[PDB]
Design an enzyme around this catalytic site. Structure first.
Site, PDB file in Angstrom:
ATOM      1  N   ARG A  45       0.906  -0.943  -0.018  1.00  0.00           N
ATOM      2  CA  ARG A  45      -0.017  -0.043   0.059  1.00  0.00           C
ATOM      3  C   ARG A  45       0.852   1.207  -0.082  1.00  0.00           C
ATOM      4  NH1 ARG A  45      -5.682   1.244   0.731  1.00  0.00           N
ATOM      5  NH2 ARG A  45      -5.816   2.961   2.058  1.00  0.00           N
ATOM      6  N   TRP A  97      -8.609   6.263  -0.584  1.00  0.00           N
ATOM      7  CA  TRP A  97      -8.421   7.308   0.467  1.00  0.00           C
ATOM      8  C   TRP A  97      -9.658   8.281   0.074  1.00  0.00           C
ATOM      9  CZ3 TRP A  97      -3.662   5.456  -1.493  1.00  0.00           C
ATOM     10  CH2 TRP A  97      -2.677   5.016  -0.419  1.00  0.00           C
ATOM     11  N   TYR A 149       3.719   9.029   3.309  1.00  0.00           N
ATOM     12  CA  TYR A 149       4.044   7.738   2.791  1.00  0.00           C
ATOM     13  C   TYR A 149       5.314   7.782   1.672  1.00  0.00           C
ATOM     14  CZ  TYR A 149       0.766   4.385   4.725  1.00  0.00           C
ATOM     15  OH  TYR A 149       0.155   3.708   5.517  1.00  0.00           O
TER      16      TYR A 149
END
Lengths: 323, 318, 323, 318
Positions: free
Chosen positions: B274, B297, B306
């Site tokens: 992910r 999201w 991220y």
DNA sequence: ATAACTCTATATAATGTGCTATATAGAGTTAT
DNA sequence: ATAACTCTATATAGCATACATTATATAGAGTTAT
DNA sequence: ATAACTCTATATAATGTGCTATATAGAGTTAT
DNA sequence: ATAACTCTATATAGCATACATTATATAGAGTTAT
């Protein structure tokens, strides 16, 4: 509820590290001001009465203070009461109405949020064209500073926090710096920064003269006394106040004596170089991500405020009109 | 009254199902931890006293727990209370302020919420280049899983929930996976995740050699025993610890056994793909809106850390 | 508060045109169901008690009804009470919790919102390849219908509402239609629609046979009796129920007898052609604006639900993976 | 108590300035209309009785007023009450339901909220091609105004508020206009609207021939008398009815005098350029996000009706 | 005897409606 | 004496956690068909 | 006498924080 | 007788106003420097 309130403020004192020292400073500052005004105007400062707080807010405005400043006051007063079990001044119809009104009134008289005076490449080259040649220890140091500042867009506090160990050496002897630009948790832990053949040379000198390299728990930047003699330290960095001075003292060198009396961003402050590198990076069509990141910024609405008077950012309408 | 409270909580237990099973596991895990701390210090566990709660939280912080766990404890204690019809421990200055202070004190000593080790395209391609050749059932399953993980960005919990009846095709022959519930959504609408021609094949091979298609309502993924025989089920899912191990096993494969440190994220984990796919997409120059539709999201904030150039050295070197 | 409630329901009856007839129908429908269940379960239907409403909602689920249906019930019950001064069932912790739970439980057993079965170009050509040749009045009419339907993406109600006067004649004798597809106010008033050389020919026939052109306050579509004899009217349009029939009766012609017992979108319904033209338009990479508009849709989340199993819409990830 | 109410309202009048002047004009305009209807039917004007309010609203609808005006009356009556500390007329079923019914009954008989006649690029270019040549002060002003209107999309009310001190330049020599307050925002942040090289010139000429630059705090726009002499002011703005007339005058110029119908929007108006520029941008293929930054909008809904192809006839004709 | 789980526990990371129409099986209605 | 700071206190520009869950991380202990 | 407003009124359309840092003038501190 | 509807009632998919202002639209009546 005096016993309730007593308990509440003891709570506030017991866990005071729940807030930053600056926050407490501003709290204290607002209270002193509010209290001094209540005294002069025969009012009880605690708890604060809607009508009194309202008169104050207007007194703040008539003092010609900015909206954002009046907010900080209300804000601090609201927190005081919220943190001592008393009603917040904000939750009163007279203080809600007056803030609104004063806000509108001020924006309609030309209330302008200001920002830092850009320290762009054009100024770097210029100041560089004026100091790279001096043998003055505080002149070589100051040159490094604006070199780092501008190149890396690091916060002043980050430049101060630096230590000699934190510096590497890359492709063609270029330099790199392990930093930390985050009030942690769900963010980054550090970031590492690299210099150019230009500011890498500038800093080299600092290192050469400062002689700072001698005790690597040392900080890159240190004070330079009137005899033009540096003073290393692994336990004391240069005060933000000084870094701000290097910027201001520098604008003066080029533009001389404080200007257009009144204040606020008349010379370069500690954020000038970030505000400056940003536009330059935008002026070479870099990327908002490449940028936003380049400066550690997380929520764009600010970077944009910086590149707004630029032709790149003119808007779809001007594009259309110029078909 | 103690009477509503007996009811309010009884009413909660009646419809426990309105909450994730994992919400109950943590509520009880917390109440356990708390009640045990109360029993030890001669304190009443419920209703909680703000001062007791504050000593508890400082105890946790002294145990060296993460700011996030400490908050988990407080949030569970706040749900118990609030859903009881009572006031939240967090509703008091002692608690409100102590929490802030623990965070502040912790995050000002370093502490960072970690994130999984990234599993990106290069990692996929390497693992695939090696595993592709195995005729082993486990290997064919694991490879198909890793492809979906990375392709879809779905959470393990969600992939484990895929039933055979859930797959379909685009006219182009690409597998389409219907997704009902997710950490962030529970609707009869759900999503349809499209696999690549490559990942579709990987999946097709897994279905083929496993026989999970014997029953449409069978979960896509299941256990495969030492003798290579699968074990399809319409009632039982491949376990969350299994899905996690696929990730560590795979990583063990390429880099060998993990450190002796006992730290977290020394190898890939259920969240690795992910995180990695998230940035492969950034690099690729995908649009945040698109990167968003990828990982289901709805805001634009996790996406952001991220993946936290040399732009300036380039501008200066002329 | 019986007198309060009495006043409230009189309010409800006095200004009943405050809601659409369909709304009242569903209200009435839910009440009959709720009431019949309360009777069977010895409960008072008004006002509704949290615990009773909760048992009902579960009874609804055990009846295997869909989440959206259970919502409509709660919804109607909530409105009844809100509109008679009584507490809404929703504002009760037991009905809030159970709805949540049932929602989650159902989505986790494969509860799938359904939509109309696409009536795409592929079906138009096909049905066309099967009826353009018949001299059957109800066969020529039905062909026009699916011609208009598919070409224009107009709502069934809009096709019915049409009148002969509402039809023009453009480039090469092409046709155009002044419509109205908005429950007004801050929207459009009308929109005008054009046909192709194909469906313009199909409709021509309808006009030719129906002989409808004779009294222009007439409606384009009218009933066609068993003797294959049309029946114009300027005061009566074809019932939505019929239009739905042309679609269903048509799927049957190609696929025969109702299918896979259980119901819901087994054949083409009145929305099939819109769902169909949309994908086709998307399959030729048209534009979401060109589309969203092409169908009168205002808030995209729906069009997308239609073009979702398409390869065009596969997602950035599949693009990346296929480098 | 009637005592808070006397206070709550007194408190509102004290800080009237928290609201648009136009909010007061309408509040009083409504109270006037209402109190007059009350006096005529022997009814108490305040506090309002739901049944009285309902008869009023039906009276308005019988007067043939727009659903929007009727709502204006109700909303003003609701503000009076609510800000008084009392319950809103809308808070009662009689009122709630009657409103819905009036809308429903009106909008089911046709009625549509109109929007200004569009003033687009072609219109600008034509007016400019004709007016460009005038050496008349009025003409130079009007042309500069029309350019800003269209370029910036600013509302008239907002352009009238532009003070000379507010203009600056991009390094490219383009005029930059700082915008403080707007219908949708009142901050010390405000916006900076950039004019084109062409529109900048148009503005420069207006400044030049007018002398509005004599005082930085002077409004950009002002009246110009029959003798062609401007009349700059730092205190008084060019009037909203004037700004409106520039639009109708201009339109009168190209198409001549307007219908005898007495309808609204038979010619351009203060909002024409906003609507038109909005779609010139759509056509141009601008991004809704961009179209949004243009018209300072923060949602994405008005943008939407301002511009409501042959895609199907094309797909069918092969 | 064991590979390959599953379970259980604590520890820690990550994220976001109310009114109107439509679908459809059924029952009722007319004219052929 | 001052250059060169460092501190203070206030004005103001610039962020970032808290809510309420829902999930993942991962080691250990037990399970079962081989 | 009038162009070019301004004002006034009603009618109708259109739209969306709380904690921490930074800036800066001032006062205080040390070593040169 | 049935084809061919039209209605009913319920299941379910698909939207769209209401809040609280803040502004525009525009004709009429008054204003003032020419």
């Amino acid at each position: 509820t005096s016993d309730e309130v007593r308990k509440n403020l003891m709570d506030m004192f017991r866990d005071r590290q729940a807030f930053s020292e600056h926050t407490w400073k501003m709290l204290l500052s607002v209270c002193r001001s509010w209290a001094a005004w209540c005294k002069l105007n025969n009012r009880k400062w605690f708890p604060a009465e809607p009508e009194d707080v309202r008169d104050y807010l207007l007194y703040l405005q008539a003092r010609g203070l900015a909206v954002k400043t009046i907010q900080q006051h209300l804000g601090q007063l609201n927190m005081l009461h919220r943190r001592s079990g008393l009603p917040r001044p904000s939750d009163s119809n007279a203080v809600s109405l007056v803030m609104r009104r004063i806000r509108k009134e001020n924006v309609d008289a030309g209330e302008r949020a200001k920002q830092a005076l850009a320290f762009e490449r054009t100024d770097f080259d210029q100041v560089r064209s004026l100091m790279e040649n001096s043998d003055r220890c505080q002149d070589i140091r100051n040159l490094a500073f604006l070199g780092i500042a501008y190149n890396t867009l690091l916060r002043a506090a980050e430049i101060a926090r630096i230590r000699v160990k934190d510096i590497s050496r890359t492709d063609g002897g270029r330099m790199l710096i392990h930093i930390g630009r985050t009030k942690t948790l769900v963010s980054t832990a550090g970031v590492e920064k690299a210099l150019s053949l230009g500011v890498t040379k500038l800093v080299e000198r600092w290192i050469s003269v400062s002689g700072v390299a001698d005790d690597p728990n040392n900080y890159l930047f240190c004070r330079v006394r009137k005899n033009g003699v540096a003073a290393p330290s692994a336990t004391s960095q240069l005060s933000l106040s000084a870094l701000h001075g290097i910027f201001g003292a520098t604008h003066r060198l080029i533009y001389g004596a404080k200007d257009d009396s009144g204040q606020r961003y008349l010379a370069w402050s500690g954020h000038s170089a970030r505000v400056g590198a940003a536009r330059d990076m935008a002026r070479a069509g870099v990327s908002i991500p490449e940028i936003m990141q380049a400066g550690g910024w997380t929520n764009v609405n600010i970077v944009m405020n910086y590149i707004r008077n630029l032709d790149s950012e003119t808007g779809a309408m001007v594009r259309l009109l110029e078909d």
